[PDB]
Write a protein that binds this DNA or RNA. Structure first.
Length: 1073
RNA sequence: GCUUU
């Protein structure tokens, strides 16, 4: 309950010249007392009288009611920041070394010197793009410093290391003043031109870095990055993190986890000797020298000290540096520069062509319905992003303009213009509009915003391809329900003194122009073989259209902005923006490794234990008939690099016997690591999310980094949430939401009152508040209704429906109309109306919670019923599993040591149910977990009608509606839906093995009847409760269940009527991946 | 205001 106490200290610190705590209660008499108290406080404040007596008088309200919010009457003028800053601004300002970056605009020159005029100005290269200000970030850091000013021992040292660093930020900012933001949290030319261009973004990165510094090492690291970052805006992250790829090969393996036949982690006590040829050491030294030539001193030395022994025990520092480098900010170049960088492929093309054929051979020969109705499938899938151009769209009687894909498809159909048979050109006559992708450390990459003809022509085929990948192990990212641990396990498995692993970064090759000829040609040749496999008109056309998109792309042209002009240049490289992007890139990366591996063997003989492609990297484990020597590693590596070299591929190819390093993960000393470089105070782009969503996303981000090994102080994160979640009532009246409002599992949830522990209402006030928030979950949008009522819109819904189903529509039909009514939310105006409505409703709700006929069941209600029927009891679980993920905080790690871990994702969509599979066999429709959940619970006759309504044949529909499987699906769908409502796949829980025998013993549940739904929920509720206690207490408890038989029947009815909850916290997990 | 997968 410390967030509420913390918020007051912050408000009191921020404003000094009143605060009005607003409470509420589920009890009537208590609430009146709350109402009376709020009134007296306002009146006393409106008379400069002390509220001390009132607090004593309404002691009962403070003691038992629930704090709902805090009123802030501050008559200042959003200043204080300028005044506050000077005391910390005593150090010497930093001076940008305008000689470090190649592209001139990447140097921290004075804004004016880059944009001499207000019309030449652009924040496109420094925009933090986040709904929180620099001024607020400074206030948050200062507030923290004041609080930990009188600390002692080690806590003081943390304050001292931080105070130093903040001085650099302060001193530098003062020399120019604090950049004032506009209503849209953007920094304009007038504020900007006096000050260094990158001043604001750099301040955000430094503040974020310093507020994450605890040890002396963090402080040394933060200081170097902060000082270097101010001048270097293009190679510091790459220079700092580059040595890591060499390092993983160095550390020896002394016992590691592997993957067994059951596809699960299992400890192996083996030893693998790290074998490194002398050349690798020179390469590492060159990397270290480069860091040194760039000003870096402390960071290179740490790697150097580490290099003497190379102990996995002192490897955490190396990992820490790798995670840290990302927090320097994103490299935001100019579209043109990002764009500009861009005989022996016979084997490579053939593999790409062959792989394409295998993935579709079976679907095509049979005459798969999805291939036949591909166009219908493309339409249902269609997003609401960009089609490319801003079109004038007339809806009903409203002439509005949008660039949205969904909008363009409806308008085009309503005017015979909808023509997917014709796949538009993307050459000189019709230049491809451009999208961008910004990442830390790496160079900016471009993205094709192709017209919807392209998505539709490609959506069905890609889906078939993904399915082939789903059951193919080479495709690490798509295989089964697998998570990163299984991939980690697979590399370790075959490691020994007679095998070496070969990892390779091929991010550069994908964007290579050398790559595009063999790529498109390989896919097309494959498409032709597939076409000569059937005579189906639907299959050939869908198949043919896919062939056409590859052909149009072969010679594409792009629209690159060059100031305020749009130069058109002939782009001859494979960029992304296609539906087949990830799958195709995966097929190509795998083909490339196979091609290199085949070429190398002509020389040396080895065995291919495993080959893998995962995103932008690819790797393989080879086995030799003899023991691996340093000389052998060098020979295999030189030959591999040369083979890559002959193909004209600029790639990083390394060889080792113990580790690997790829963009998503890295294995050092038999242990698994994940870069923790998600930036907090700077974003990649500007979306359409709100401050509240942004606050939830930041918290989510804080949690992922903390699990990954980088921890930003929670008090700082809490302070940021208080600023972001606040709402202005006027210019001197600001409202701050309480801890209960923020964390309770509702539609307005932003974070968990306790990290890694999700709570659910177990008190009446919490229930009362939870019900009230839902009451105002979905808000109306006039603009949305208009278009929802327009012809062009209704016809589109109708047209899609008449093409999909045969018999009758409504469970399916109501859904199609909504799905479409939603894709209108991408359209700002509609989104803006919704936010304004939410704010007014929220302001009133915080002021005095309303009523609600409830009558709506949720997950929290089901849990609340079960709680009272369990008897706790101290228990003991010994730690039995060695740590394989070193960075995990201690409380999370302990749960893994005691109950173990998992290498899969729990089915939470219902796809593995027979009914969902049956629908897939005959329909192109895809029901959600929620729809399946309502449908499965329908009367036997209704289910038969729904299946038929979707084109499912009668013998099949009839056979299922009775069978053993239908009864089984019922349990399976609910089980899938419930897991979905409990975030069992997100955050910290995704790690834990919920079917641990050790966990299982702690649950003592006596069967008093036998009714699946109830048995599954009671065990799950118990597992979560036991685990949460372990997460918060470090010890365990055993749970006993004495749930009545009469009670179970009541509960079972309750279970089939659970409503899902939508909230920023929920969106944030979805947002992560 | 722009912002594919």
């Amino acid at each position: 309950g410390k967030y509420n106490l913390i918020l007051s200290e912050y408000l009191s610190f921020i404003y000094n010249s009143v605060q009005i705590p607003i409470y509420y209660s589920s009890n009537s008499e208590l609430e009146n007392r709350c109402i009376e108290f709020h009134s007296k406080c306002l009146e006393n404040s409106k008379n400069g009288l002390s509220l001390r007596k009132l607090f004593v008088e309404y002691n009962d309200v403070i003691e038992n009611a629930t704090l709902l919010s805090i009123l802030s009457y501050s008559y200042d003028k959003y200043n204080a920041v300028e005044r506050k800053l000077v005391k910390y601004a005593k150090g010497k300002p930093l001076e940008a070394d305008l000689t470090v970056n190649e592209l001139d605009y990447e140097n921290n020159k004075m804004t004016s010197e880059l944009f001499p005029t207000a019309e030449e100005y652009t924040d496109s290269l420094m925009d933090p793009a986040i709904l929180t200000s620099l001024s607020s970030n400074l206030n948050a850091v200062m507030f923290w410093l004041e609080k930990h000013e009188n600390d002692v021992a080690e806590k003081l040292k943390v304050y001292k290391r931080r105070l130093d660093l903040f001085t650099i930020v302060a001193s530098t900012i003062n020399k120019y003043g604090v950049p004032r933001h506009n209503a849209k949290y953007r920094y304009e030319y007038d504020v900007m031109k006096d000050k260094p261009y990158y001043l604001v973004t750099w301040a955000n990165s430094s503040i974020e870095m310093l507020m994450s510094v605890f040890s002396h090492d963090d402080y040394l690291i933060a200081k170097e990055l902060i000082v270097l970052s101010y001048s270097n805006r293009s190679t510091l992250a790459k220079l700092v993190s580059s040595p890591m790829s060499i390092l993983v090969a160095l550390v020896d393996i002394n016992g590691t986890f592997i993957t067994n036949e059951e596809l699960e982690l299992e400890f192996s006590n083996k030893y693998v000797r790290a074998i490194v040829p002398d050349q690798t050491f020179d390469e590492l030294n060159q990397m270290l020298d480069n860091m040194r030539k760039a000003g870096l001193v402390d960071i290179p030395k740490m790697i150097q000290d580490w290099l003497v022994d190379r102990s996995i025990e002192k490897f955490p520092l190396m990992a820490k540096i790798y995670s840290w480098s990302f927090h320097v900010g994103f490299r935001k170049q100019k579209m043109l520069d990002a764009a500009l960088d861009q005989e022996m492929y016979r084997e490579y093309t053939m593999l790409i062509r062959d792989e394409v054929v295998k993935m579709l051979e079976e679907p095509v020969k049979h005459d798969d319905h999805l291939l036949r109705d591909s166009e219908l499938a493309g339409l249902l899938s269609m997003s609401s992003a960009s089609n490319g151009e801003s079109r004038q769209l007339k809806f009903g009687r409203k002439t509005i303009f949008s660039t949205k894909k969904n909008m363009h498809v409806m308008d085009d159909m309503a005017n015979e213009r909808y023509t997917p048979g014709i796949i538009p050109p993307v050459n000189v006559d019709k230049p491809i509009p451009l999208g961008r992708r910004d990442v830390p450390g790496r160079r900016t990459r471009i993205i094709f915003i192709l017209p919807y003809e392209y998505f539709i022509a490609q959506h069905a085929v890609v889906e078939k391809m993904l399915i082939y990948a789903k059951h193919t192990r080479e495709y690490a990212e798509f295989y089964s329900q697998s998570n990163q641990l299984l991939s980690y396990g697979d590399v370790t498995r075959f490691l020994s003194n007679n095998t070496m692993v070969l990892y390779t970064d091929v991010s550069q090759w994908d964007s290579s122009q050398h790559n595009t000829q063999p790529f498109r040609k390989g896919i097309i040749m494959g498409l032709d073989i597939l076409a000569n496999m059937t005579n189906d008109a639907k299959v050939l056309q869908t198949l043919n259209l896919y062939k056409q998109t590859q052909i149009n792309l072969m010679d594409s042209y792009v629209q690159i902005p060059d100031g305020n002009v749009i130069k058109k240049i002939q782009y001859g490289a494979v960029a992304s923006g296609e539906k087949q992007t990830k799958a195709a890139n995966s097929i190509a990366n795998l083909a490339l490794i196979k091609t290199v591996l085949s070429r190398i063997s002509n020389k040396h003989s080895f065995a291919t234990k495993i080959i893998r492609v995962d995103g932008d990297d690819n790797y393989a484990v080879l086995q030799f008939n003899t023991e691996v020597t340093k000389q052998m590693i060098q020979d295999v590596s030189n030959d591999v690099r040369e083979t890559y070299a002959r193909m004209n591929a600029k790639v990083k190819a390394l060889v080792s016997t113990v580790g690997i390093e790829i963009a998503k993960r890295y294995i050092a000393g038999g242990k698994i690591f994940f870069r923790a470089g998600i930036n907090l105070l700077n974003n990649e782009k500007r979306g359409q999310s709100t401050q509240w969503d942004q606050a939830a996303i930041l918290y989510s981000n804080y949690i992922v980094n903390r699990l990954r090994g980088f921890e930003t102080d929670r008090e700082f994160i809490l302070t940021k949430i208080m600023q972001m979640t606040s709402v202005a009532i006027t210019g001197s009246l600001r409202l701050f939401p309480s801890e209960r409002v923020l964390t309770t599992n509702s539609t307005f949830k932003v974070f968990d009152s306790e990290d890694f522990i999700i709570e659910y209402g177990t008190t009446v006030d919490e229930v009362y508040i939870q019900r009230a928030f839902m009451s105002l979950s979905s808000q109306k949008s006039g603009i949305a209704d208009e278009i929802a009522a327009s012809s062009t819109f209704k016809n589109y819904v109708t047209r899609l429906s008449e093409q999909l189903l045969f018999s009758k529509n409504n469970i399916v039909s109501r859904g199609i109309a909504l799905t479409e009514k939603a894709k209108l939310n991408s359209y700002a105006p509609i989104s803006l109306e919704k936010r304004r409505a939410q704010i007014s409703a929220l302001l009133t709700m915080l002021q005095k919670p309303v009523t609600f006929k409830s009558s709506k069941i949720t997950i929290n209600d089901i849990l609340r019923d079960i709680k009272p029927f369990f008897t706790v009891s101290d228990a003991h679980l010994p730690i039995q599993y060695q740590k394989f993920m070193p960075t995990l905080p201690d409380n999370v790690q302990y749960i893994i040591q005691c109950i173990g871990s998992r290498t899969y994702q729990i089915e939470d969509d219902g796809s593995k149910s027979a009914i969902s599979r049956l629908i897939s066999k005959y329909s192109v429709y895809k029901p959600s977990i929620e729809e399946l959940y309502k449908v499965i619970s329908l009367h036997e006759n209704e289910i038969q009608l729904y299946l038929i309504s979707l084109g499912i044949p009668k013998i099949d529909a009839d056979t299922y509606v009775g069978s053993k499987i239908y009864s089984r699906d019922k349990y399976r769908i609910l089980e899938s839906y419930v897991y979905n409502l409990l975030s069992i796949n997100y955050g910290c829980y995704q790690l834990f093995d919920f079917n641990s025998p050790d966990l299982e013993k702690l649950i003592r549940i006596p069967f008093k009847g036998k009714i699946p739904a109830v048995t599954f929920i009671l065990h799950l509720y118990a597992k979560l409760e036991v685990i949460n206690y372990a997460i918060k207490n470090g010890s365990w408890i055993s749970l006993f269940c004495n749930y009545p038989k009469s009670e179970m029947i009541k509960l079972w009815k309750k279970m089939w009527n659970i409503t899902s909850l939508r909230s920023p916290y929920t969106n944030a997990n979805f947002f992560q991946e």
